[PDB]
Amino acid sequence: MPHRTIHLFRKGLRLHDNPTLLAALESSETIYPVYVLDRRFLASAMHIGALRWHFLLQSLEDLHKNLSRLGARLLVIQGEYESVLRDHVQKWNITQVTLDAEMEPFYKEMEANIRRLGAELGFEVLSRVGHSLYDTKRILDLNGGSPPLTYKRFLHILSQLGDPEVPVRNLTAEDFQRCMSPEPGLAERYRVPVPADLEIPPQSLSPWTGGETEGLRRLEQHLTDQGSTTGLSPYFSMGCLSVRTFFQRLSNIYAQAKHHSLPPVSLQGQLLWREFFYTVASATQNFTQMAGNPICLQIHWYEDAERLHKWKTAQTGFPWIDAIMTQLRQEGWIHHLARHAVACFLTRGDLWISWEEGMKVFEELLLDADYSINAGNWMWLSASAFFHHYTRIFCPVRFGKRTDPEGQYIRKYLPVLKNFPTKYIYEPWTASEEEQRQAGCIIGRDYPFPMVNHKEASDRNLQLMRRVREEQRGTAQLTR
């Protein structure tokens, strides 16, 4: 097998169900498994917070360990990807570069530039899809060339298409005996960087740890506990876990239960929601912004950086909202309906700030930040597309009360409020100043007053949204 190959990890930080890396190994006599850490590229394409950096480095550490157990290695190269390739195609006499066929525009542009470099330097480029359950193009073709714009229509097209693609086999020590992974000269240059190399605090405090190994453990620990959700989203978004592998595992449980257990089928539905947004995002221009986006309602959101700042820094004065944003910032993950609460509050519900700004904050702070899922759900929660019950607005006081009447979640993440009686824990501004003194927390000093009046703001915003939907009837109809 002739090729000397670089495989470029970008997502796909796993060895199970990795069709591109498998294709690389089957076609090559020597291989260099590489992650290019390109700060200039990421600076131009992404917003990445400290917790996300920690999860990436942990996932790279684990990938290095798993490759090393098979007689190989991970090579982390720090630089601009074009210069890195010019240098290392020469150093390693490369004839093939492999990389996953990611759908993100910034990844597609990188891929286009790498293909152009291959035409110049003399390497072929091979890609396989490792991020989706289905061949997205097949879904588009069955729907006449355009993506389904409702989940119902999406499911109808999938029922014509059939089952998802199956995972490919695991990689083995024999693969790296047939296709050798040489230790390069100057190998200390290729170590996984440590947090201080990225100027981030050294200790990661997220209850999440990156990597394929922890992803697989968590997956199996969830199914055993089932005998709160999976908490697997960061592993799917980073590629530490294959959605095809998880889909098939759920099918295995359904089969062994003689088709009598529907909970695994419900969880398969969560991955179909992921696939829905990936499919729309892959075939919709300007998907992650409002202007020029053909399915997005055009809404003149306020430019009010101070409102955004208060929301982002958990200083809205609504404890339920600030507690969620605090868990997001400190841990990097929040429950689906917690995301509903704060996204509705920021956009159509209260602050009337663009969903694009909420998306960018979530991108920075979420371990599971995902181009397609995040944009799709932010359009949903702002009632810009997909969701149309705009007279229904989450109450930033009452919603948590049903869940957690005593406010234990609030007291955990906002300990300044920990001594407030539950009668005030969701609306501490209604306490008298003397009750505030007794709780040790003066509103406006230790914890802010509420930044809007929810009743007045949501009333305002309902009238604004109604004008939008009465005028842009055709746009709203696209996703209903």
Ligand SMILES: Cc1cc2nc3c(=O)[nH]c(=O)nc-3n(C[C@H](O)[C@H](O)[C@H](O)COP(=O)(O)OP(=O)(O)OC[C@H]3O[C@@H](n4cnc5c(N)ncnc54)[C@H](O)[C@@H]3O)c2cc1C
């Ligand atoms: C405003 C907003 C922004 C969001 N941004 C993201 C994001 O950047 N990345 C992300 O992975 N999810 C995002 N979500 C979706 C959802 O909240 C998370 O997928 C889920 O909370 C992750 O927890 P889990 O793995 O326990 O989910 P589970 O319920 O265990 O679901 C299993 C998997 O299915 C997928 N999934 C579940 N719900 C959805 C959904 N509504 N849409 C798409 N895929 C779904 C995820 O890959 C998830 O890991 C967003 C939701 C909202 C409302």
